[PDB]
C-alpha cells in the first residue's frame, strides 16, 4: 500500500505544485470555486490519478502520510487543497532564469516511450520537478523532452555525463538555452 500511496502523493503534489499549478487552466479555475478546496470527485477525473485509484479513502490516507505537507485534507475528507500557508512562488525574472538554467533538452527516446518509462529512466539521474514530453501538431510524441531538475547542480551533472543512453539509443542532451 505504501508504494501506491507514494505514487498518489507524488501525482497529486505534482498537480498542485509550483510548476504545474501556474499553468493548469482547469485546476486554477477549480481552486477559485471554494477557497482552494477541490472535491475528490473532481480529482479522480484527472487521468493519471484515476489510473492509480478512485477510492477517496485511499487518496486521503496517502496524503495524510505525505512528507511534503503541501496538501490539506478537509474535515469530512471529501476535499483537498494546496495549503494556504504554502503560497505559489513569485514569478520574477530571476525565478524564470533560475528555472531555465536547470532545464534540460533531451532527444533520442523512441516515439512510443511513455511518461512512466521516462520517469523511471530519470529516477537515477537526479531529482526532477517536471518532464515535458514534446509533441507534434497531431499530438504524437516527438522523441524529445524538456526536464526541469531540482538544482543547476543536478542539471549540470546530468548534462556533463557523457555517453548517456535510453536503453541502447544514444541521446542528444543540451541545456534548454543551448537548444
UniProtKB/Swiss-Prot annotation:
Residue numbers bearing the Phosphothreonine modification? 111
Output the superkingdom of the source species.
Eukaryota
Q: Which residues carry this modification: N6-acetyllysine?
A: 107, 119
Question: Where in the numbering of this chain does the RRM domain appear?
Answer: 102-178
Q: List the disulfide bonds.
A: none
Localization annotation: Nucleus
Membrane-spanning ranges: none
Modification comment = Phosphorylated. The phosphorylation sites are at the C-terminal part of the protein.
Coiled coil region boundaries: none
User: Which residues are annotated with the PTM Phosphoserine?
Assistant: 83, 85
Q: Ranges for the HTH La-type RNA-binding domain?
A: 1-90
Describe its assembly. Interacts with DDX15. May interact with RUFY1.
Protein's job: Binds to the 3' poly(U) terminus of nascent RNA polymerase III transcripts, protecting them from exonuclease digestion and facilitating their folding and maturation. In case of Coxsackievirus B3 infection, binds to the viral internal ribosome entry site (IRES) and stimulates the IRES-mediated translation.
User: What does the miscellaneous comment read?
Assistant: Sera from patients with systemic lupus erythematosus (SLE) often contain antibodies that react with the normal cellular La protein as if this antigen was foreign.
* Name of the protein in question: Lupus La protein
What fragment of the whole protein does this chain represent?
10 to 188 of 408
Amino acid at each position: 500500500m505504501a508504494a501506491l500511496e507514494a505514487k498518489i502523493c507524488h501525482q497529486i503534489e505534482y498537480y498542485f505544485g509550483d510548476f504545474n499549478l501556474p499553468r493548469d487552466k482547469f485546476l486554477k479555475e477549480q481552486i477559485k470555486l471554494d477557497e482552494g478546496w477541490v472535491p475528490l470527485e473532481i480529482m479522480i477525473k484527472f487521468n493519471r490519478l484515476n489510473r492509480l485509484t478512485t477510492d477517496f479513502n485511499v487518496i486521503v490516507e496517502a496524503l495524510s502520510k505525505s512528507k511534503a505537507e503541501l496538501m490539506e485534507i478537509s474535515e469530512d475528507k471529501t476535499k483537498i487543497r494546496r495549503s494556504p500557508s504554502k503560497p505559489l512562488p513569485e514569478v520574477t525574472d530571476e525565478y524564470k532564469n533560475d528555472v531555465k538554467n536547470r532545464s534540460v533538452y533531451i532527444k533520442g527516446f523512441p516515439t512510443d516511450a511513455t511518461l512512466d518509462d521516462i520517469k523511471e529512466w530519470l529516477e537515477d539521474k537526479g531529482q526532477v520537478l517536471n518532464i515535458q514530453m514534446r509533441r507534434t501538431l497531431h499530438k504524437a510524441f516527438k522523441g524529445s523532452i524538456f526536464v526541469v531538475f531540482d538544482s543547476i547542480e543536478s542539471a549540470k551533472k546530468f548534462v556533463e555525463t557523457p555517453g548517456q543512453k535510453y536503453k541502447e539509443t544514444d541521446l542528444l542532451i543540451l541545456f534548454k538555452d543551448d537548444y
